[PDB]
Coordinates of C-alpha atoms and ligand atoms in Angstrom, one line a residue:
Chain I
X1 CA 0.6 9.8 -5.4
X2 CA 0.7 13.6 -4.4
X3 CA -1.2 16.3 -6.5
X4 CA 1.1 19.2 -7.6
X5 CA 1.9 21.9 -10.2
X6 CA 3.2 19.0 -12.6
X7 CA 0.0 16.8 -12.7
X8 CA -2.5 20.0 -12.7
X9 CA -4.3 19.2 -15.9
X10 CA -5.4 16.0 -14.1
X11 CA -8.0 18.2 -12.2
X12 CA -9.8 18.8 -15.4
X13 CA -9.8 15.2 -16.9
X14 CA -13.0 13.0 -17.2
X15 CA -12.0 10.9 -14.0
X16 CA -14.6 12.2 -11.4
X17 CA -12.7 13.7 -8.5
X18 CA -13.5 15.8 -5.4
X19 CA -11.3 18.1 -3.3
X20 CA -12.1 18.1 0.5
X21 CA -11.2 20.9 2.8
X22 CA -11.9 20.6 6.4
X23 CA -10.4 24.0 7.6
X24 CA -14.0 25.5 8.4
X25 CA -15.3 22.4 10.1
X26 CA -14.4 23.2 13.6
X27 CA -14.7 27.1 14.2
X28 CA -14.5 28.7 17.6
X29 CA -14.2 32.4 19.2
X30 CA -11.8 32.3 22.1
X31 CA -13.0 34.5 25.1
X32 CA -12.3 35.2 28.7
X33 CA -14.6 33.7 31.6
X34 CA -15.8 35.6 34.7
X35 CA -12.9 34.1 36.8
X36 CA -10.4 35.3 34.0
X37 CA -9.7 31.9 32.5
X38 CA -10.0 31.3 28.7
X39 CA -12.9 29.3 27.1
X40 CA -14.0 28.6 23.3
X41 CA -17.5 28.9 22.0
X42 CA -17.9 26.9 18.8
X43 CA -20.0 28.5 15.8
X44 CA -21.4 26.4 12.8
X45 CA -18.9 25.2 10.4
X46 CA -18.9 23.4 6.9
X47 CA -17.1 20.8 4.9
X48 CA -16.1 22.2 1.5
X49 CA -16.2 19.2 -1.1
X50 CA -15.7 20.4 -4.6
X51 CA -15.8 18.9 -8.1
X52 CA -13.1 21.2 -9.8
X53 CA -14.2 20.1 -13.2
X54 CA -18.0 20.8 -13.0
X55 CA -18.0 23.5 -10.0
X56 CA -20.5 21.1 -8.1
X57 CA -20.1 22.1 -4.3
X58 CA -21.4 19.8 -1.5
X59 CA -21.4 22.0 1.3
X60 CA -22.0 19.9 4.4
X61 CA -23.0 22.3 7.3
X62 CA -21.6 21.2 10.7
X63 CA -24.1 22.6 13.4
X64 CA -22.4 23.2 16.9
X65 CA -24.6 20.5 18.4
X66 CA -22.2 17.9 16.9
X67 CA -19.5 19.1 19.3
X68 CA -21.9 18.7 22.6
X69 CA -20.1 16.8 25.3
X70 CA -17.3 15.5 22.9
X71 CA -13.5 15.9 23.9
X72 CA -10.6 16.4 21.6
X73 CA -12.7 18.4 19.2
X74 CA -9.8 19.3 16.6
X75 CA -9.2 15.6 16.4
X76 CA -12.9 14.6 16.1
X77 CA -13.3 17.2 13.4
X78 CA -11.2 15.2 11.2
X79 CA -13.0 12.0 11.8
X80 CA -16.6 13.8 11.4
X81 CA -15.2 15.1 8.2
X82 CA -14.2 11.7 6.9
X83 CA -17.6 10.1 8.2
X84 CA -19.7 12.6 6.2
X85 CA -17.5 12.5 2.9
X86 CA -17.8 8.7 3.1
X87 CA -21.7 9.0 3.7
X88 CA -21.9 11.7 0.6
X89 CA -19.9 8.9 -1.5
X90 CA -22.4 6.1 -0.4
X91 CA -25.5 8.3 -1.2
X92 CA -24.3 9.0 -4.9
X93 CA -25.2 6.6 -7.7
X94 CA -22.3 4.3 -8.8
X95 CA -21.5 6.2 -11.9
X96 CA -21.5 9.5 -9.9
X97 CA -19.0 8.3 -7.3
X98 CA -15.4 9.8 -7.4
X99 CA -12.4 7.7 -8.7
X100 CA -10.1 10.1 -6.3
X101 CA -10.6 12.2 -3.4
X102 CA -7.8 14.9 -2.8
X103 CA -7.6 16.4 0.9
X104 CA -6.1 19.8 1.2
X105 CA -4.6 18.7 4.8
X106 CA -2.4 15.6 5.1
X107 CA -4.1 15.2 8.6
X108 CA -7.3 14.1 6.8
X109 CA -5.4 11.2 4.9
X110 CA -5.8 8.4 7.7
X111 CA -9.5 9.5 8.9
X112 CA -10.6 9.3 5.3
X113 CA -8.7 6.0 4.3
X114 CA -10.2 4.4 7.4
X115 CA -14.0 5.6 6.6
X116 CA -13.6 4.5 2.9
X117 CA -12.2 1.0 3.4
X118 CA -15.3 -0.1 1.6
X119 CA -14.1 1.6 -1.5
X120 CA -10.6 0.1 -2.1
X121 CA -10.7 1.5 -5.7
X122 CA -11.2 5.2 -4.6
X123 CA -7.8 6.7 -4.3
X124 CA -7.3 9.1 -1.3
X125 CA -4.5 11.7 -2.1
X126 CA -2.9 14.7 -0.6
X127 CA -1.8 17.7 -2.6
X128 CA 1.4 20.0 -2.7
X129 CA -0.9 22.9 -3.8
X130 CA -1.6 25.5 -1.3
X131 CA -5.2 26.1 -2.0
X132 CA -7.3 29.1 -0.6
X133 CA -10.6 27.0 0.3
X134 CA -10.5 28.3 3.9
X135 CA -11.7 31.7 2.4
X136 CA -15.1 30.0 1.4
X137 CA -16.6 31.5 4.4
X138 CA -15.7 34.9 2.6
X139 CA -18.5 34.2 0.1
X140 CA -21.6 35.9 1.7
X141 CA -24.2 33.5 0.4
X142 CA -22.0 30.5 1.8
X143 CA -21.4 32.3 5.2
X144 CA -25.2 33.0 5.4
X145 CA -26.5 29.5 4.9
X146 CA -23.8 28.1 7.5
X147 CA -24.6 30.9 10.2
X148 CA -28.5 30.5 9.8
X149 CA -28.6 26.6 10.0
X150 CA -30.4 25.3 13.3
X151 CA -29.6 21.6 12.4
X152 CA -27.2 19.6 10.2
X153 CA -27.8 20.3 6.5
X154 CA -26.2 19.6 3.1
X155 CA -26.6 22.7 0.5
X156 CA -25.7 22.2 -3.2
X157 CA -24.2 25.0 -5.1
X158 CA -22.3 25.5 -8.5
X159 CA -19.2 27.6 -7.4
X160 CA -18.5 28.6 -11.0
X161 CA -22.1 30.0 -11.4
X162 CA -22.6 30.0 -15.2
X163 CA -18.8 30.5 -16.1
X164 CA -18.5 26.9 -18.0
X165 CA -20.8 28.2 -20.4
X166 CA -18.0 30.7 -21.7
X167 CA -14.7 29.1 -20.3
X168 CA -13.0 25.8 -19.7
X169 CA -12.9 24.3 -16.2
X170 CA -9.0 25.0 -16.2
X171 CA -9.8 28.7 -16.4
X172 CA -13.0 28.5 -14.1
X173 CA -10.7 26.9 -11.4
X174 CA -7.9 29.7 -12.1
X175 CA -10.6 32.4 -11.6
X176 CA -12.1 30.6 -8.5
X177 CA -8.8 30.2 -6.6
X178 CA -7.6 33.8 -7.6
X179 CA -10.9 35.2 -6.1
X180 CA -10.3 33.0 -2.9
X181 CA -6.7 33.9 -2.5
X182 CA -7.7 37.7 -2.8
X183 CA -10.4 37.2 -0.1
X184 CA -8.0 35.2 2.0
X185 CA -5.3 38.0 1.9
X186 CA -7.5 41.0 2.2
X187 CA -11.1 40.4 2.6
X188 CA -12.3 44.1 2.6
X189 CA -10.3 45.0 -0.5
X190 CA -11.6 41.8 -2.4
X191 CA -15.1 42.5 -1.6
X192 CA -14.7 46.3 -2.6
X193 CA -13.3 45.2 -6.1
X194 CA -16.3 42.7 -6.6
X195 CA -19.2 44.8 -5.3
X196 CA -18.3 48.4 -5.9
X197 CA -20.0 49.0 -9.3
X198 CA -23.7 49.0 -8.4
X199 CA -24.8 48.3 -12.1
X200 CA -23.2 44.8 -11.8
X201 CA -25.4 42.5 -9.5
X202 CA -25.3 38.8 -8.3
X203 CA -28.2 36.9 -9.8
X204 CA -30.5 35.3 -7.1
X205 CA -29.2 31.8 -8.2
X206 CA -25.4 32.8 -8.2
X207 CA -22.6 33.5 -5.8
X208 CA -20.5 36.0 -7.8
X209 CA -21.5 39.1 -9.7
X210 CA -22.6 39.1 -13.5
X211 CA -19.3 40.2 -15.2
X212 CA -19.0 40.2 -19.0
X213 CA -15.8 38.8 -20.4
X214 CA -14.0 42.0 -20.5
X215 CA -15.1 42.9 -16.9
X216 CA -13.6 39.7 -15.7
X217 CA -10.4 40.4 -17.3
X218 CA -10.4 43.6 -15.3
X219 CA -11.5 42.1 -12.1
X220 CA -8.8 39.3 -12.4
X221 CA -6.1 42.1 -13.0
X222 CA -7.4 44.0 -9.9
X223 CA -7.2 40.8 -7.8
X224 CA -3.7 40.0 -8.8
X225 CA -2.6 43.7 -8.0
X226 CA -4.2 43.1 -4.3
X227 CA -2.2 40.0 -3.8
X228 CA 1.0 41.8 -4.8
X229 CA 0.1 44.9 -2.9
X230 CA -0.5 42.9 0.2
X231 CA 2.6 40.8 -0.3
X232 CA 4.6 44.3 -0.5
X233 CA 2.6 45.5 3.0
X234 CA 3.5 42.1 4.6
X235 CA 7.3 42.0 3.8
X236 CA 8.1 45.7 3.5
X237 CA 9.0 45.3 -0.3
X238 CA 8.8 48.1 -2.9
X239 CA 6.3 46.4 -5.2
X240 CA 6.8 49.1 -8.0
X241 CA 10.5 48.0 -8.3
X242 CA 9.5 44.3 -9.1
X243 CA 9.7 42.9 -12.7
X244 CA 7.0 40.8 -14.5
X245 CA 9.0 37.5 -13.9
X246 CA 9.3 38.4 -10.1
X247 CA 5.5 39.4 -10.2
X248 CA 4.8 36.1 -12.1
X249 CA 6.2 33.7 -9.4
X250 CA 4.6 35.3 -6.3
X251 CA 1.4 35.1 -8.2
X252 CA 1.8 31.1 -8.0
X253 CA 4.4 30.4 -5.5
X254 CA 2.1 31.4 -2.6
Chain K
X1 CA 20.9 -34.4 27.2
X2 CA 20.1 -34.6 23.4
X3 CA 22.6 -34.7 20.5
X4 CA 22.6 -33.5 16.9
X5 CA 25.4 -35.3 15.1
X6 CA 27.1 -34.0 12.0
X7 CA 28.1 -36.6 9.1
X8 CA 31.0 -34.1 8.4
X9 CA 31.8 -30.4 7.8
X10 CA 33.2 -30.1 4.1
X11 CA 32.9 -26.4 3.8
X12 CA 34.0 -23.6 6.3
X13 CA 30.9 -22.3 8.0
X14 CA 30.0 -20.3 11.2
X15 CA 27.5 -22.7 13.3
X16 CA 24.8 -21.2 15.6
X17 CA 23.0 -23.3 18.2
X18 CA 20.5 -20.8 19.8
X19 CA 22.4 -17.9 21.1
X20 CA 25.9 -19.5 20.9
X21 CA 28.1 -19.7 17.7
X22 CA 31.4 -21.1 16.6
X23 CA 33.6 -21.2 13.3
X24 CA 34.4 -24.7 11.7
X25 CA 37.2 -25.0 9.1
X26 CA 36.8 -26.6 5.6
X27 CA 37.1 -30.4 6.4
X28 CA 37.6 -29.8 10.4
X29 CA 36.9 -33.2 12.1
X30 CA 33.7 -31.9 13.6
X31 CA 30.8 -34.3 14.3
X32 CA 28.2 -32.1 16.2
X33 CA 26.8 -30.6 19.4
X34 CA 25.9 -32.6 22.4
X35 CA 24.2 -31.9 25.9
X36 CA 21.3 -29.9 24.1
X37 CA 18.8 -29.0 27.2
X38 CA 15.4 -31.1 26.8
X39 CA 12.4 -28.9 27.3
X40 CA 12.9 -26.1 24.7
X41 CA 12.7 -25.7 21.1
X42 CA 16.2 -25.1 19.5
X43 CA 17.6 -23.5 16.3
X44 CA 20.8 -24.6 14.6
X45 CA 21.9 -21.9 12.0
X46 CA 24.7 -21.5 9.4
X47 CA 26.4 -18.8 7.6
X48 CA 29.0 -19.9 5.0
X49 CA 32.6 -18.5 5.4
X50 CA 32.9 -18.2 1.4
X51 CA 29.3 -16.6 1.0
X52 CA 27.7 -14.7 4.0
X53 CA 24.6 -14.5 1.8
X54 CA 24.1 -18.2 2.5
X55 CA 22.3 -17.8 6.0
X56 CA 19.7 -20.4 7.0
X57 CA 18.8 -22.7 9.7
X58 CA 16.5 -25.3 11.3
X59 CA 14.0 -25.1 14.2
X60 CA 13.8 -28.6 16.0
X61 CA 12.7 -30.2 19.4
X62 CA 14.8 -33.4 20.4
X63 CA 11.7 -34.9 22.0
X64 CA 10.1 -35.3 18.7
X65 CA 12.9 -37.5 17.0
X66 CA 16.5 -38.1 16.3
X67 CA 18.0 -35.2 14.1
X68 CA 21.4 -35.0 12.3
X69 CA 23.1 -32.7 9.9
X70 CA 24.7 -33.7 6.6
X71 CA 26.0 -31.3 3.9
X72 CA 24.6 -31.7 0.4
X73 CA 27.1 -30.8 -2.2
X74 CA 24.4 -30.5 -4.8
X75 CA 22.2 -27.9 -2.9
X76 CA 25.3 -26.4 -1.3
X77 CA 23.9 -26.5 2.2
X78 CA 23.8 -28.2 5.4
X79 CA 20.7 -30.1 5.7
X80 CA 18.8 -31.4 8.7
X81 CA 17.5 -35.2 8.6
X82 CA 15.6 -37.5 10.9
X83 CA 17.1 -41.0 11.6
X84 CA 14.2 -43.3 12.1
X85 CA 16.6 -46.3 13.3
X86 CA 17.1 -45.5 17.0
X87 CA 19.9 -48.1 17.5
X88 CA 21.8 -46.8 14.3
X89 CA 21.5 -43.3 15.7
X90 CA 22.6 -44.3 19.3
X91 CA 25.7 -46.1 17.9
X92 CA 26.6 -42.9 15.8
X93 CA 26.1 -40.6 18.7
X94 CA 28.2 -43.0 21.1
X95 CA 31.4 -43.3 18.8
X96 CA 31.5 -39.5 18.1
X97 CA 31.2 -38.8 21.9
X98 CA 34.0 -41.4 22.8
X99 CA 36.1 -39.8 20.1
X100 CA 35.4 -36.2 21.6
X101 CA 34.4 -34.8 18.1
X102 CA 31.4 -32.7 19.4
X103 CA 31.2 -29.2 20.9
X104 CA 29.1 -29.1 24.2
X105 CA 25.9 -26.7 24.4
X106 CA 27.5 -24.2 26.7
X107 CA 24.6 -23.5 29.2
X108 CA 25.7 -21.5 32.4
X109 CA 23.6 -23.1 35.4
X110 CA 22.4 -19.5 36.4
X111 CA 21.5 -18.6 32.8
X112 CA 17.8 -18.6 32.0
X113 CA 18.4 -16.5 28.6
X114 CA 17.1 -19.3 26.3
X115 CA 13.9 -20.1 28.3
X116 CA 13.3 -16.5 28.5
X117 CA 13.5 -16.1 24.8
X118 CA 11.3 -19.1 23.8
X119 CA 8.9 -19.3 26.8
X120 CA 5.8 -19.3 24.8
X121 CA 7.4 -20.9 21.3
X122 CA 6.3 -24.3 20.7
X123 CA 7.5 -26.7 17.8
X124 CA 3.8 -27.5 16.7
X125 CA 3.0 -23.8 16.2
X126 CA 6.3 -23.2 14.2
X127 CA 5.3 -25.9 11.9
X128 CA 2.1 -24.0 10.9
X129 CA 4.0 -20.6 10.4
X130 CA 6.5 -22.9 8.3
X131 CA 4.6 -25.4 6.2
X132 CA 6.6 -28.6 5.4
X133 CA 4.6 -31.3 6.7
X134 CA 6.9 -34.4 5.6
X135 CA 9.6 -33.1 8.2
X136 CA 9.4 -32.7 12.1
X137 CA 11.8 -29.8 12.0
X138 CA 11.4 -26.3 10.2
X139 CA 13.9 -24.5 7.6
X140 CA 14.0 -20.6 7.9
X141 CA 16.6 -18.4 5.9
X142 CA 17.4 -14.7 5.6
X143 CA 15.3 -14.2 2.4
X144 CA 12.0 -16.1 2.8
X145 CA 9.1 -13.5 2.6
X146 CA 5.8 -13.6 4.8
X147 CA 2.4 -13.9 3.4
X148 CA 1.9 -10.2 4.1
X149 CA 5.0 -9.1 2.0
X150 CA 3.8 -11.6 -0.9
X151 CA 0.4 -9.6 -0.9
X152 CA 2.2 -6.0 -1.2
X153 CA 5.9 -14.9 -4.7
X154 CA 6.4 -18.8 -4.2
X155 CA 3.8 -19.6 -1.4
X156 CA 5.3 -23.0 -0.4
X157 CA 8.4 -21.1 0.9
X158 CA 6.6 -18.4 2.9
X159 CA 6.5 -17.5 6.6
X160 CA 2.7 -17.8 7.3
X161 CA 2.7 -15.3 10.2
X162 CA -0.7 -13.9 11.3
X163 CA -1.5 -10.7 9.1
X164 CA -1.8 -7.6 11.1
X165 CA -3.0 -4.4 9.3
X166 CA -4.1 -1.4 11.2
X167 CA -5.9 0.0 8.1
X168 CA -8.0 -3.2 7.1
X169 CA -11.7 -4.1 7.5
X170 CA -10.4 -6.7 10.0
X171 CA -8.9 -4.0 12.3
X172 CA -11.9 -1.6 12.1
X173 CA -15.6 -2.1 12.8
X174 CA -18.0 -0.3 10.5
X175 CA -19.4 2.7 12.6
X176 CA -16.4 2.7 15.0
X177 CA -13.8 4.0 12.7
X178 CA -12.2 6.7 15.0
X179 CA -12.7 4.4 18.1
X180 CA -10.9 1.3 16.6
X181 CA -8.2 3.3 14.8
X182 CA -7.1 5.3 17.8
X183 CA -7.7 2.5 20.4
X184 CA -6.8 -0.9 18.7
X185 CA -8.4 -2.8 22.0
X186 CA -11.1 -4.4 19.6
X187 CA -8.5 -5.7 17.1
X188 CA -6.2 -7.1 19.9
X189 CA -8.8 -8.6 22.2
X190 CA -11.8 -9.8 20.0
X191 CA -10.0 -10.3 16.5
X192 CA -6.7 -11.7 17.4
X193 CA -6.8 -12.9 20.9
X194 CA -10.4 -14.4 21.2
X195 CA -10.5 -15.0 17.6
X196 CA -7.3 -16.1 15.8
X197 CA -4.7 -17.0 18.6
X198 CA -7.3 -18.2 21.2
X199 CA -5.0 -17.1 24.2
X200 CA -2.1 -14.6 24.8
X201 CA 0.5 -17.7 25.1
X202 CA -0.1 -18.2 21.3
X203 CA 0.2 -14.6 20.6
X204 CA 3.5 -14.2 22.7
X205 CA 4.9 -17.4 20.9
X206 CA 4.4 -15.8 17.5
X207 CA 5.8 -12.5 18.6
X208 CA 9.1 -14.4 20.2
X209 CA 9.5 -16.7 17.2
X210 CA 9.4 -13.5 14.8
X211 CA 11.9 -11.8 16.9
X212 CA 14.4 -15.0 16.8
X213 CA 14.1 -15.3 13.1
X214 CA 14.8 -11.5 12.7
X215 CA 17.8 -11.7 14.9
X216 CA 19.3 -15.2 13.8
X217 CA 18.6 -14.9 10.0
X218 CA 18.3 -11.1 9.6
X219 CA 15.0 -12.1 8.1
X220 CA 13.2 -8.5 7.4
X221 CA 9.5 -9.7 7.2
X222 CA 10.0 -11.3 10.7
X223 CA 11.2 -8.0 12.0
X224 CA 8.2 -6.3 10.5
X225 CA 6.0 -8.9 12.3
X226 CA 7.8 -8.7 15.6
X227 CA 7.1 -4.8 15.6
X228 CA 3.5 -4.9 14.6
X229 CA 2.7 -7.5 17.3
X230 CA 4.3 -5.0 19.7
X231 CA 2.4 -2.0 18.3
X232 CA -0.8 -3.8 18.5
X233 CA -0.7 -4.3 22.2
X234 CA 1.0 -0.8 23.0
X235 CA -1.7 0.9 20.8
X236 CA -4.6 -0.9 22.9
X237 CA -6.2 1.1 25.9
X238 CA -7.4 -2.3 27.4
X239 CA -4.9 -5.1 27.8
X240 CA -5.0 -7.6 30.7
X241 CA -2.3 -6.7 33.4
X242 CA -1.0 -10.1 33.1
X243 CA -0.3 -9.5 29.4
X244 CA 1.4 -6.4 30.0
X245 CA 3.6 -7.7 32.8
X246 CA 4.5 -10.6 30.7
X247 CA 5.2 -8.4 27.3
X248 CA 7.5 -6.2 29.6
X249 CA 9.6 -9.5 30.6
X250 CA 9.7 -10.7 27.0
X251 CA 10.8 -7.5 25.4
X252 CA 13.6 -7.1 28.3
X253 CA 15.2 -10.4 27.5
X254 CA 14.9 -9.6 23.6
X255 CA 16.6 -6.1 23.9
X256 CA 19.2 -7.8 26.4
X257 CA 20.1 -10.4 23.8
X258 CA 20.2 -8.2 20.6
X259 CA 24.0 -7.7 19.6
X260 CA 24.6 -3.9 20.1
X261 CA 26.2 -3.7 16.7
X262 CA 22.8 -4.9 15.0
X263 CA 20.6 -2.3 16.7
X264 CA 20.4 0.1 13.7
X265 CA 19.0 -2.7 11.3
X266 CA 16.9 -4.8 13.9
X267 CA 14.9 -2.0 15.8
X268 CA 12.3 0.5 14.3
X269 CA 12.6 4.1 15.8
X270 CA 9.1 5.0 15.0
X271 CA 7.5 1.8 16.7
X272 CA 9.7 2.1 20.0
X273 CA 9.5 5.8 20.5
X274 CA 5.6 5.4 20.0
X275 CA 5.4 2.3 22.3
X276 CA 7.7 3.8 25.0
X277 CA 6.7 7.4 25.1
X278 CA 3.4 8.1 23.3
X279 CA 1.2 5.1 23.6
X280 CA -1.6 3.8 26.0
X281 CA 1.2 1.6 27.6
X282 CA 4.1 4.3 27.7
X283 CA 3.9 3.7 31.5
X284 CA 3.4 -0.1 31.6
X285 CA 6.9 -1.4 30.3
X286 CA 9.2 -0.4 33.1
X287 CA 11.9 -3.2 32.5
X288 CA 11.9 -2.7 28.7
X289 CA 12.0 1.3 29.1
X290 CA 15.0 1.0 31.6
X291 CA 17.1 -1.4 29.3
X292 CA 16.3 0.5 26.2
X293 CA 17.2 3.9 27.6
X294 CA 20.6 2.5 29.0
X295 CA 21.5 0.3 26.0
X296 CA 20.1 2.4 22.8
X297 CA 19.6 5.9 24.1
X298 CA 20.5 7.1 20.4
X299 CA 17.5 5.2 18.7
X300 CA 15.1 7.2 21.3
Ligands
T9S401 C1 -8.4 33.5 -14.7 C2 -6.9 34.0 -14.5 O1 -6.1 33.2 -13.5 C3 -5.2 33.9 -12.5 O2 -4.9 35.1 -12.8 N1 -4.9 33.3 -11.5 C4 -4.9 31.9 -11.1 C5 -4.7 32.1 -9.5 C6 -5.0 31.3 -8.6 C7 -4.4 31.6 -7.3 N2 -3.7 32.6 -7.2 C8 -3.4 33.4 -8.3 C9 -3.9 33.0 -9.5 C10 -3.7 33.8 -10.8
T9S402 C1 -2.7 -19.9 15.7 C2 -2.0 -18.8 14.8 O1 -0.5 -19.0 15.3 C3 -0.3 -19.4 16.6 O2 -1.1 -19.6 17.3 N1 1.2 -19.2 17.0 C4 2.1 -19.2 15.9 C5 3.4 -19.5 16.8 C6 4.6 -20.0 16.4 C7 5.5 -20.3 17.2 N2 5.1 -20.5 18.6 C8 3.9 -20.3 19.0 C9 3.1 -19.7 18.2 C10 1.5 -19.6 18.3

């Protein structure tokens, strides 16, 4: 059924599964016309399709040409997402096809179920989790490949870099969602925490900096404080007054 | 001018004939129903006074044979039977009429209600939905499941309504996923009308039969089928003008006939709100929208 806090270890079992997030597929800037009307201008988007066990990210770049002369674009975007996920599944060898696809937005359920009628044994599920995958476009190297694209393109990444050499997929997913939540809440502050010590760089073949295990512990702590700091700024709350139990809950609850 | 005699009425029962009903007492001298209009299919139905769970009946056409009712004390129900001896049957009916032991089908001369409910319903089509080839009449009851319900147990006792499923390969052409899901015209016009039903008259007959089984028996799978056949039309951008005009008439008489006190169990809020206010055909069902707004404004 619905993926939640209860059935969370299920993300890291040996049943192949993918998360699909459609929140960066259809992207626009809203602007004034010469006559003082409002118009949109689309920019390049992406489907964020992620294996949470392996870190394999299928970034399908959505070029603005897709939208040319189409109507009801927010509706079409869900169906185009479903079309491309079903094309990806059909492209994979049988032993690599997912057993489950989890959509981050319940509006993707019917479009994806309809495109996957040929795969009755692939379960299409919603989730109760509020996942921060909208912030994928805060990862500089992902933003760069999307905005430079001149045509439809699929790019493959490992969103965990080499982390699984040192940590479990449970802890890698934790680190990923904490980093994306911080980038979503305060992008400027998040980037300044990641990128401020010049001695620590991003490998050419990586998305994130090359932190030692001890430095990751410090980074993770600075990200958790950023999310608390911003929660205090947003709700006018004295953070310094909160307990570790209070702090604990806001650091998932969101 | 046709007659369905009863051997006797050994148990207290409410008897329906089409939209009419009356109470018969345990061992009351009741010997049946006379003056049944030729030209239409009819339904005789029963609800036992000592057990309202016993709810069942028979579809029949008096043009296809001589039918009577006889209580079976083993199976504990009123059974329809065919009498093949014409002269015996004629003699039975004659005696019961002379002794005035029969109720008269109470048709008001102005009243086209039954024709309006059964316009497209034909006994040969009922016999394909309800399969029991040794009888010319068809047994239905409140608990009988549909082939579709049995997919999501005993197949011999099933209502074989045409399966409608909006998220099925039958409903959705590969490559036209969004198109076919948001506009059901393909599924209505090519698959159902041209393909399975052959014409709108057969589609409406099944729709009307499903309504009648839902209303007269409280058959849940019948109510599901009635709503699915309405939703398939209302969700189609391209429907012939004659089919929309006829559907408006069909639904008007169905909503007219529904007992006010069963509206809560027989009408699906989502489907009616969608059909009348959001669908392609939201503006095409003037008579149905007016009677629904005036009779059931709560539901909406
Ligand atoms: C690796 C350590 O993990 C965490 O500290 N998290 C996961 C996580 C994910 C999303 N928001 C907050 C948090 C706190
Ligand atoms: C051919 C598939 O089924 C039909 O065509 N019917 C069912 C049916 C049941 C009662 N009256 C008319 C009809 C038309």
